[PDB]
Paper text:
Strigolactones (SLs) are phytohormones that control many aspects of plant growth. Despite their relatively recent discovery as plant hormones, rapid progress has been made in understanding SL function, including the identification of a signalling pathway for SLs. This pathway involves the SL receptors of the DWARF14 (D14) class of α/β-hydrolase enzymes, the MORE AXILLARY GROWTH2 (MAX2) F-box proteins, and the SUPPRESSOR OF MAX2 1 (SMAX1) and SMAX1-LIKE (SMXL) family of chaperonin-like proteins. The D14 α/β-hydrolase enzyme uses a Ser–His–Asp catalytic triad to perceive and hydrolyse SLs simultaneously. OsD14 has a α/β-hydrolase fold with a seven-stranded β-sheet core domain flanked by seven α-helices, of which two are shorter 310-helices.
The structure of O. sativa Dwarf14 (OsD14) was determined by X-ray crystallography to a resolution of 1.35 Å from a construct lacking the first 51 residues. Inserted between strands five and six of the central sheet are four helices connected to the core by a β-hairpin loop on its N-terminal side and a shorter loop on the other side. This domain, commonly named the helical cap, forms a V-shaped lid over a deep cavity, which is assumed to bind the SL hormone. At the bottom of the cavity is a canonical catalytic triad consisting of Ser147, His297, and Asp268. After model building of the protein, residual density was observed in the ligand-binding cavity. We identified this as originating from MPD, which was used as a precipitating agent during crystallization. MPD was added as a racemic mixture of (4S)-2-methyl-2,4-pentanediol and (4R)-2-methyl-2,4-pentanediol, and it appears that both stereoisomers were able to bind in the cavity. Judging from the electron density, there was a preference for binding the 4S stereoisomer in one subunit (arbitrarily named molecule B in the PDB co-ordinate file). MPD is located some distance away from the catalytic triad, forms several hydrophobic interactions with residues lining the cavity (Phe78, Phe176, Phe186, Val194, Val244, and Phe245), and hydrogen-bonds to the hydroxyl oxygen of Tyr209 and to Oγ of Ser147 and Nε2 of His297 via a water molecule. In the second subunit (named molecule A), the binding of the 4R stereoisomer appears to be preferred, and the direct interaction with the Tyr209 hydroxyl group is replaced by a solvent-mediated contact. The helical cap covers MPD like a dome, but is open to solvent on one side in this conformational state of the receptor.
Numbering used by the authors: 52 to 318
């Protein structure tokens, strides 16, 4: 907690304004993934950036495998950062696992989260009886095996699929941070995400929410955005980016920045 947590998770506060925005990165990146959208926000907003404890840019000996076996422990870190910074109200932009973290955080502390922007967002990745999440159990078992048997080969193959569009600089950048993650931590985060099911709690979210949908995301079927819009408890809209990929902040930052400026205008 406190100043030590601000140090350990590389917390940075840039820009200025009464509109505070937290940018929270996803699996396989760190806060540098926001570097190209950041200049579109800092004239108008006070921006809080931090690294998840699993990021390769954080000393991996801080990663407590027992503590971080659920997403609520990541929520605890986020809340402790905002409390240490004395921030009473903010908008939160979360990618991937951070979209799940933001949902949970907005339920824990509805006073603190005035708006959510969710990128690469899903409440559940595994398929269920009448629910298409995009993944089967046997498929993820093989992914987990590949991550353990040869993490470098797995990451080399995953990076272009996650970026989706043929944007070589974005593949190189995502690869860099993926290869920066300790393989056991990377596997553990993925296992934690795949066992999370937020469907039942979506109606507890009170904050307005913008769900950013790209034209294809290897981890998020197109139908998930409509599910989130139907079930999130706040005023929710889906904003459609005119390109593909799981990491639009890396592959199409100027387009994503348009959505962010609109979504962060008033809250």
């Amino acid at each position: 907690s406190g100043a030590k947590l601000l140090q350990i998770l590389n917390v940075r506060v840039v820009g200025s304004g009464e509109r505070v925005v937290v940018l929270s990165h996803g699996f396989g990146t760190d806060q540098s993934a926001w570097s190209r959208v950041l200049p579109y926000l800092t004239r108008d907003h006070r921006v809080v950036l931090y690294d998840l404890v699993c990021a390769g840019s954080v000393n991996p000996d801080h990663f407590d495998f027992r503590r971080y076996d659920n997403l609520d422990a990541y929520v605890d870190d986020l809340l402790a950062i905002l409390d240490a910074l004395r921030i009473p109200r903010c908008a939160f932009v979360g990618h991937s696992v951070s979209a799940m973290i933001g949902i949970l955080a907005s339920i824990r502390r509805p006073d603190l989260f005035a708006k959510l922007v969710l990128i690469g967002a899903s409440p559940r990745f595994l398929n269920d009886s009448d629910y298409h999440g995009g993944f089967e159990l046997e498929e993820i078992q093989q992914v987990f095996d590949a991550m353990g048997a040869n993490y470098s080969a797995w990451a080399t193959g995953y990076a272009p699929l996650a970026v989706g569009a043929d944007v070589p600089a974005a593949v190189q950048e995502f690869s860099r941070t993926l290869f920066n993650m300790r393989p056991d931590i990377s596997l553990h985060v993925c296992q934690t995400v795949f066992k999370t099911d937020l469907r039942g709690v979506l109606g507890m979210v009170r904050a307005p929410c913008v769900v950013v949908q790209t034209t294809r995301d290897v981890s998020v079927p197109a139908s998930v955005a409509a599910y989130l819009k139907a079930h999130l408890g706040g005023r929710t809209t889906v904003e459609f980016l005119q390109t593909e990929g799981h990491l639009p902040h890396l592959s199409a930052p100027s387009l994503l920045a348009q959505v962010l400026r609109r979504a962060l205008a008033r809250y």
